[PDB]
Amino acid sequence: SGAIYVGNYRVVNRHLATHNDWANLVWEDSSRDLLVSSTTAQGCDTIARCDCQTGVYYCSSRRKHYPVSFSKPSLIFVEASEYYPARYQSHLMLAVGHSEPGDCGGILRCQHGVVGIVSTGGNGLVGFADVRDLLWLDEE
Numbered sequence: 297s298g299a300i301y302v303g304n305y306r307v308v309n310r311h312l313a314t315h316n317d318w319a320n321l322v323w324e325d326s327s328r329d330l331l332v333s334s335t336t337a338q339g340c341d342t343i344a345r346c347d348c349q350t351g352v353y354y355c356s357s358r359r360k361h362y363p364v365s366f367s368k369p370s371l372i373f374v375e376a377s378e379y380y381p382a383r384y385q386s387h388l389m390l391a392v393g394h395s396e397p398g399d400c401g402g403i404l405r406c407q408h409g410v411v412g413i414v415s416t417g418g419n420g421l422v423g424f425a426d427v428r429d430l431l432w433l434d435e436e
């Protein structure tokens with residue numbers, strides 16, 4: 297689990313979005329595993345606006361933050377896990393690291409702020425859904 301709180305926006309994994317998220321929906325994209333819902337309270341997080349390929353991510357299944365190198369956001373074949381069927385995913389960044397299902401939503405951060413959230417695991421690569429292209433998160 298985990299979310300990004302920026303302005304009056306809550307950014308979650310689409311697959312973990314609650315009924316309330318869907319009932320307060322701003323934007324969702326199944327190809328990116330992202331859903332954004334509206335918030336009453338303004339949020340504390342800054343989104344990175346950068347092309348960084350190094351950062352640190354939170355891995356709940358280890359209660360640890362790990363420094364990683366990650367690929368630039370792209371369209372990736374996410375292999376079937378114990379939990380979820382195989383599917384293609386856009387705006388996904390990969391690193392070598394550990395991931396479990398409950399790790400989805402863990403933040404990946406660089407010097408500029410939040411880069412993305414853990415979205416894909418179970419087969420040796422940790423995938424992060426990029427948010428840095430979502431400039432609109434920093435306005436309205």
Ligand SMILES: Cc1ccccc1OCC(=O)N(C)C
Pocket residue numbers: 311374377378379380395396397398399400414415416417418419
């Ligand atoms: C973070 C993780 C670890 C292990 C399995 C699934 C995971 O993430 C969810 C996922 O891959 N999908 C396609 C919804």
Ligand SMILES: [Zn+2]
Pocket residue numbers: 344345346347348406407408409
């Ligand atoms: Zn950066």
